[PDB]
Every structure is written in structure tokens, then in C-alpha cells.
Amino acid sequence: SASKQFHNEVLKAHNEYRQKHGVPPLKLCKNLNREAQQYSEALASTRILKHSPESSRGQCGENLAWASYDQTGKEVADRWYSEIKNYNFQQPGFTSGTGHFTAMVWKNTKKMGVGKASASDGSSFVVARYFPAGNVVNEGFFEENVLPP
């Protein structure tokens, strides 16, 4: 189906990128998929982008993606990963502008959930959930979890 294909494409892209950084691949988790899907539907209903309660409370990592059209799994992953251009491996650490990239390749992250929903106007809302949550800011965490390509 459309949902399964999208999930598989997002996972495939994430894992190909993680291989470029020498970190273990992620595994999809059905419950995480359901939670991400539920949130994507909530975002599609309001059409207002914002982070979920789970994300705000640091329970799960979360990446969001919006487009005026129906997004493919590959394009979403590529957009998030592209932030690597602005990540300085010589001075490791968190930055909002590279947050999607660092969450994607976070070494210690093991599982992911993916969801996508379209609004009344056809725009799509994509939600990726990560566990354990990455982007841990304390000293040493980024150097250990965000490795150079």
C-alpha cells in the first residue's frame, strides 16, 4: 500500500545515510509508526506545524516535514540530511539548523516511527519519531553520536 511504501522508503533512506556515517541502522516500530501517524493527522487537520508533547518532553526525538504536495520518503530524508552542510565536525554540538540531520544519524538512536497525512488543501505533513531521543546537549554527546561521513 501507499503507507507501507512510504514507511519503507523513509527507512531505506535513513539507513543509507547512517551507513555513510558508520552507525547502526534503525528499525521501524509499529507502535511508533502509529503514534507518528496519529500526530501527522493532527497536524494535517490544523495545518499548523509544531512539535508534539512527546517531542517537547524529550520522550522521543522528532523530525517534521511539510510540502504543498504529497511527499515521497526519499525527498523527506534527503531534505533533513542536507543540513550536514552546516554542521562543523571540528566543533561538535547542537544547533537548531542542523537538528534534523543530527537526529537522523544519531548513533545511539535505535528505532523510528514514520507518519504522513494530507490536509484538505493537499499539502502533506510528515512526522518521524526517534527512540531513544537524540540531540542530547551535554558535553561529549555530539562527538560520540554524530560521526563524520
Curated annotation (Swiss-Prot):
A GO BP entry: positive regulation of epithelial cell migration
Membrane-topology annotation of the record: Lipid-anchor
Coiled coil: 27-50
Subcellular location: Golgi apparatus membrane
Compositionally skewed regions (Basic and acidic residues) per UniProt: 6-18
Ranges where the SCP domain occurs: 11-129
Region (Disordered): 1-18
Location of the region described as Interaction with CAV1 in the Swiss-Prot/TrEMBL record: 88-95
SUPFAM superfamilies: PR-1-like
Keyword annotations of the record: Coiled coil, Golgi apparatus, Lipoprotein, Membrane, Myristate
GO cellular component labels: extracellular exosome; extracellular space; Golgi membrane
Subunit structure: Homodimer. Interacts with CAV1.
Record protein name field: Golgi-associated plant pathogenesis-related protein 1
Native organism: Homo sapiens (Human)
